Amino acid sequence: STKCTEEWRQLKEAVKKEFAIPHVPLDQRWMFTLEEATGPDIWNTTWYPKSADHVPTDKKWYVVDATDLILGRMASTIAIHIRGKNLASYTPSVDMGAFVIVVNADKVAVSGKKRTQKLYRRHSGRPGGLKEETFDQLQKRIPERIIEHAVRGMLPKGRLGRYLFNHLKVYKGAEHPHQAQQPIDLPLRDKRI
Amino acid sequence: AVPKKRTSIYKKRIRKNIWKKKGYWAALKAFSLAKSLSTGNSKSFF
Amino acid sequence: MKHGRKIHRLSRPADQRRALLRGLTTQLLKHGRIKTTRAKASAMRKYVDKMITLAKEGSLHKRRQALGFIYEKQIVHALFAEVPERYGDRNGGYTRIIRTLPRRGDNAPMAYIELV
Amino acid sequence: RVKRGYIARRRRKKIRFFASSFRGAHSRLTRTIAQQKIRALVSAHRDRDRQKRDFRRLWITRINAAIRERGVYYNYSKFIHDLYKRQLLLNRKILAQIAILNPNCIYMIYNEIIK
Amino acid sequence: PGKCDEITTRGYSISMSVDKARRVIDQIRGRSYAETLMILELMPYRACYPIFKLIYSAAANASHNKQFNKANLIISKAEVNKGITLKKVKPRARGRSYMIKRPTCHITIVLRDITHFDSYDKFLESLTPKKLIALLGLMSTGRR
Amino acid sequence: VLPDDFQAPEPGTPEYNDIINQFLPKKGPPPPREEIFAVVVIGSRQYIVIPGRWIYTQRLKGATVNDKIVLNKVLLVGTKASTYIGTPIVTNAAVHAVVEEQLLDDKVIVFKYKKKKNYRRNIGHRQPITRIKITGITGYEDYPAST
Amino acid sequence: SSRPQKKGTAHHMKTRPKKTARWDIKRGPAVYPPLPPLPAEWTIVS
RNA sequence: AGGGUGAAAAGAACCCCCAUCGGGGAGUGAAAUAGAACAUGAAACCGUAAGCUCUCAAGCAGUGGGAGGGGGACCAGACC
RNA sequence: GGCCAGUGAGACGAUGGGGGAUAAGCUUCAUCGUCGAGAGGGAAACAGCCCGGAUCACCAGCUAAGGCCCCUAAAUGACC
RNA sequence: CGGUAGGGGAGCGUUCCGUGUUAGGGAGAAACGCGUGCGUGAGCCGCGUUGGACGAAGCGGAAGCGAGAAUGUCGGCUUG
RNA sequence: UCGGAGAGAGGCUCGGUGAAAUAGACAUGUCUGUGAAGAUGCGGACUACCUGCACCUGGACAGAAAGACCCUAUGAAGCU
Structure with missing residues (x-):
């Protein structure tokens, strides 16, 4: 009897439509529908987002061009959007952030003597495996690990910064393969780059 | 050699249910042998 | 490692394994159909094919090697009077x-040996 | 004059009933039921004082992220510059609540802080 | 109670361990009497045979106490519990003595016929509840 | 002792779908209160107040039950189109409210213990709170600041 | 060698945050002009 | 070291499984979930069923906030 | 004064010294601060360092020490 | 109105006793389990398709009177 | 040196029977730092899907067993 699972499933979806209510977005929105003032007191408590507030479909998309941009301040201004601290919906327990795309990772500027003296060393578990590895060696070898190492220490390294680590999309080429949500260029507030 | 502490209900129900699931795996074989033992020309089980 | 060691040793030491082979192929030739374990079954299969084809050519030397292998006296002389009349033209696989x-009591994989 | 009793089992059964959903021998085993009652109550203390502190922090960063959407360099400190100079006594960071429940009304707040 | 559907058969504290009786009793859960009849004929366990004796004396029970058939009859729960454990003070070297417990089981197997109505269509009718008590005896997803 | 039977009254299922589809959905309209909104200052803390809401607050110094009480300490009164940004209080303001029966809130078990220095204190606290229902907001028609 | 390492509470008199800028010690809190007193919190209306 | 089925053994006639032990009907009893391991039966311990949930995760296992989901509901905003 | 206890192993930090090697989180003293018996905040963590003295509640505000790129609250603030 | 060693004041609970052959109780007492209740808390009160005969409160008294520790101890049952 | 092969009893798998020392609960990583001065438990970083089986024993200051060595007791005892 396939009609048991199918037809009772569509009856459960039908009473899901009849009992439950949708969650309206926060755009040109007033305080309450007249149904909402009869419901819970969501005013005097702190606003906490529901599942229809942090959908990854309608998140923002940002594209920087990392040509002649210095690394760490770009990493901080990518971090401040990768968290969601430019949105008034910022709750630090959910994923309110925005996807970012960093093209031209091969041409990221640094200041001083970072290129020959800053080491991206790593180590496995056994002794004597500490890998000597400098900035020009990655930028010659795999450049898109540079920025990916800069912003990974900018995000809260628990279960939630690991989830918004995948929002970072760094590509070394001049062109990114994304045409997802027509990615608008990233707004900067940094006068010294 | 001597155990430092004891195990939980957690790890014990895991290990005992791996033992009994290891008992589960050796009866669909017995269902296949009991099904082939039925009516059919099989050159076994005199 | 056991690369290419094609002797089939049982859970018994060497001389006890030889006595198990000789006694169980002796009573296998006595009753014909026999209940063994499967390791004992294949271990009977090699040696009892050697004893059917040993007295296939019923000379004195084959009869004396064959009497030397089998325990009971009156079963070797009931063998070469039976195997060319029955197991001629079979050419192996007895x-x-x-x-x-x-x-x-053991869950021992148990087998059953014919003569065909 | 023997004095066998039952009061340790009601004494102990109340603490047993409070220690539900404690994941294992913290929810079944008496000699840990006690110290999970204890540590649960002091957890309620420090997380209550720091829920006052923590929601203060949350409204500070929420209205900071609301004001910084103008683009021109108007920080959260300047919103309090011209929030106490223009005499608005103590909106108590509940403008971080109507900053998302009524974003046009907080645009009226800030656009009257400018004038 | 399911309105007179199941057949509950208990068991004596038989002289074997509970855990092996629980792997052989967790095998035969949910399967009907024919499949357990052929599997417990051939299961390579010593705990198999009193379980097969209690299944056989449980479905023969279900055919003589009730009047059912041994083909439309599935094993419902088949719970095995602990029993009494004897204590055996067995001596061992350097002057020591170990408690060797002789464990016993406590088998309770419940059997389940399908005594169904098999109604024609699904469509709900919110009328005559004193017939709705009798028309619905065993279903799923009870709303209100 | 048997399977019971099929029952035979020979019923006919009414598939008219103008009675069950009337019975199962419900028509419940929310009451239109009005397009108004204020933020009152009670005790120290401020409350989002809309006309008709069972708020909880602090006052148990003295307030009789079922009393009609004006909360005139209003800032940021707001309609649907315009809000009134309160230089501290909007003048001549009146949030009409109904101070209802007084309550004690949930138990807050204040149990303190330090460490092995053997000290532990189970005390409790029932905060003397008061539930207030809101009637309507008036006296707010000065200096509009619509955008 | 003969240079003693600074251990605990000597590490705390050395490596504690000290604001050794003579400007930032002079700072008092900001002063806004005084306001008239707010009205009554509520009023009996009969 | 091991006490207490009932008020009265009224201690289960008879049928089935079956070598027993045991179990299910039936019968006695007010009670058979009071069945001879028999009076109330708690915790540790072992289980089975139902609701939600865990397989990129670092944690004295809580607590504050609470996404999503489930249950009855009547002060339907509440409770678990 | 009456009745009636504990305590009499202290620790570090500043100053004044002796023992040492003006070595020790060393040892012994004299005045003081903290811990002991003190929670909270700053000190990454961290008894004795700075602010500070916890009756309790609030999904209140202003501050001390200390901070205002991100992790983590507040200035990628201004001028030398 | 922080608090260790410690000192003082005020209370809850338990079993028995006086009132007491108390009120109440096979129309369900004690027990055991339950709470959208009340207390500063020890605890009280209320509800139970479990159980089956005792026993409150108030005003008082007396203790083999309150458990998480003693490589405690006696039974039961785990881990490996 | 410089190990190598072979035969048994174990070890590995299956079926039966079935312990023990130990054990606060364990959701039981590495480096580095801090801390009663040798941390899975605190801090920062890095690394790790869950869970078995077979071996090895570096750590859990692993198990034993109120350190035989050292000192204290206005202890005990033997001997001179």
């Missing part, structure tokens, strides 16, 4: 390894 239920 047994059958019909398996049965495992044994109560």
Whole structure:
């Protein structure tokens, strides 16, 4: 009897439509529908987002061009959007952030003597495996690990910064393969780059 | 050699249910042998 | 490692294994159909094919090697008077390894040896 | 004059009933039921004082992220510059609540802080 | 109670361990009497045979106490519990003595016929509840 | 003792779908209160107040039950189109409210213990709170600041 | 060698945050002009 | 070291499984979930069923906030 | 004064010294601060360092020490 | 109105006793389990398709009177 | 040196029977730092899907067993 699972499933979806209510977005929105003032007191408590507030479909998309941009301040201004601290919906327990795309990772500027003296060393578990590895060696070898190492220490390294680590999309080429949500260029507030 | 502490209900129900699931795996074989033992020309089980 | 060691040793030491082979192929030639374990079944299969084809050419030397291998006296002389009349033209493959239920108390994979 | 009793089992059964959903021997085993009652109550203390502190922090960063959407360099400190100079006594960071429940009304707040 | 559907058969504290009786009793859960009849004929366990004796004396029970058939009859729960454990003070070297417990089981197997109505269509009718008590005896997803 | 039977009254299922589809959905309209909104200052803390809401607050110094009480300490009164940004208080303001029966809130078990220095204190606290229902907001028609 | 390492509470008199800028010690809190007193919190209306 | 089925053994006639032990009907009893391991039966311990949930995760296992989901509901905003 | 206890192993930090090697989180003293018996905040963590003295509640505000790129609250603030 | 060693004041609970052959109780007492209740808390009160005969409160008294520790101890049952 | 092969009893798998020392609960990583001065439990970083089986024993200051060595007791005892 396939009609048991199918037809009772569509009856459960039908009473899901009849009992439950949708969650309206926060755009040109007033305080309450007249149904909402009869419901819970969501005013005097702190606003906490529901599942229809942090959908990854309608998140923002940002594209920087990392040509002649210095690394760490770009990493901080990518971090401040990768968290969601430019949105008034910022709750630090959910994923309110925005996807970012960093093209031209091969041409990221640094200041001083970072290129020959800053080491991206790593180590496995056994002794004597500490890998000597400098900035020009990655930028010659795999450049898109540079920025990916800069912003990974900018995000809260628990279960939630690991989830918004995948929002970072760094590509070394001049062109990114994304045409997802027509990615608008990233707004900067940094006068010294 | 001597155990430092004891195990939980957690790890014990895991290990005992791996033992009994290891008992589960050796009866669909017995269902296949009991099904082939039925009516059919099989050159076994005199 | 056991690369290419094609002797089939049982759970018994060497001379006890030889006595198990000789006694169980002796009573296999006595009753014909016999209940063994499967390791004992294949271990009977090689040696009892050697004893059917040993007295296939019924000379004195084959009869004396064959009497030397088998325990009982009156079963070797009932063998070469029976194997050319029955197992001529068979040209190998004198047994059958019909398996049965495992044994109560060990779950031992238990087999059953014919003469065909 | 023997004095066998039952009061340790009601004494102990109340603490047993409070220690539900404690994941294992913290929810079944008496000699840990006690110290999970204890540590649960002091957890309620420090997380209550720091829920006052923590929601203060949350409204500070929420209205900071609301004001910084103008683009021109108007920080959260300047919103309090011209929030106490223009005499608005103590909106108590509940403008971080109507900053998302009524974003046009907080645009009226800030656009009257400018004038 | 399911309105007179199941057949509950208990068991004596038989002289074997509970855990092996629980792997052989967790095998035969949910399967009907024919499949357990052929599997417990051939299961290579010593705990198999009193379980097969209690299944056989449980479905023969279900055919003589009730009047059912041994083909439309599935094993419902088949719970095995602990029993009494004897204590055997067995001596061992350097002057020591170990408690060797002789464990016993406590088998309770419940059987389940399908005594169904098999109604024609699904469509709900919110009328005559004193017939709705009798028309619905065993279903799923009870709303209100 | 048997399977019971099929029952035979020979019923006919009414598939008219103008009675069950009337019975199962419900028509419940929310009451239109009005397009108004204020933020009152009670005790120290401020409350989002809309006309008709069972708020909880602090006052148990003295307030009789079922009393009609004006909360005139209003800032940021707001309609649907315009809000009134309160230089501290919007003048001549009146949030009409109904101070209802007084309550004690949930138990807050204040149990303090330090460490092995053997000290532990189970005390409790029932905060003397008061539930207030809101009637309507008036006296707010000065200096509009619509955008 | 003969240079003693600074251990605990000597590490705390050395490596504690000290604001050794003579400007930032002079700072008092900001002063806004005084306001008239707010009205009554509520009023009996009969 | 091991006490207490009932008020009265009224201690289960008879049928089935079956070598017993045991179990299910039936019968006695107010009670058979009071069945001879027999009076109330708690915790540790072992289980089975139902609701939600865990397989990129670092944690004295809580607590504050609470996404999503489930249950009855009547002060339907509440409770678990 | 009456009745009636504990305590009499202290620790570090500043100053004044002796023992040492003006070595020790060393040892012994004299005045003081903290811990002991003190929670909270700053000190990454961290008894004795700075602010500070916890009756309790609030999904209140202003501050001390200390901070205002991100992790983590507040200035990628201004001028030398 | 922080608090260790410690000192003082005020209370809850338990079993028995006076009132007491108390009120109440096979129309369900004690027990055991339950709470959208009340207390500063020890605890009280209320509800139970479990159980089956005792026993409150108030005003008082007396203790083999309150458990998480003693490589405690006696039974039961785990881990490996 | 410089190990190598082979035969048994174990070890590995299956079926039966079935312990023990130990054990606060364990959701039981590495480096580095801090801390009663040798941390899975605190801090920062890095690394790790869950869970078995077979071996090895570096750590859990692993198990034993109120350190035989050292000192204290206005202890005990033998001997001179």
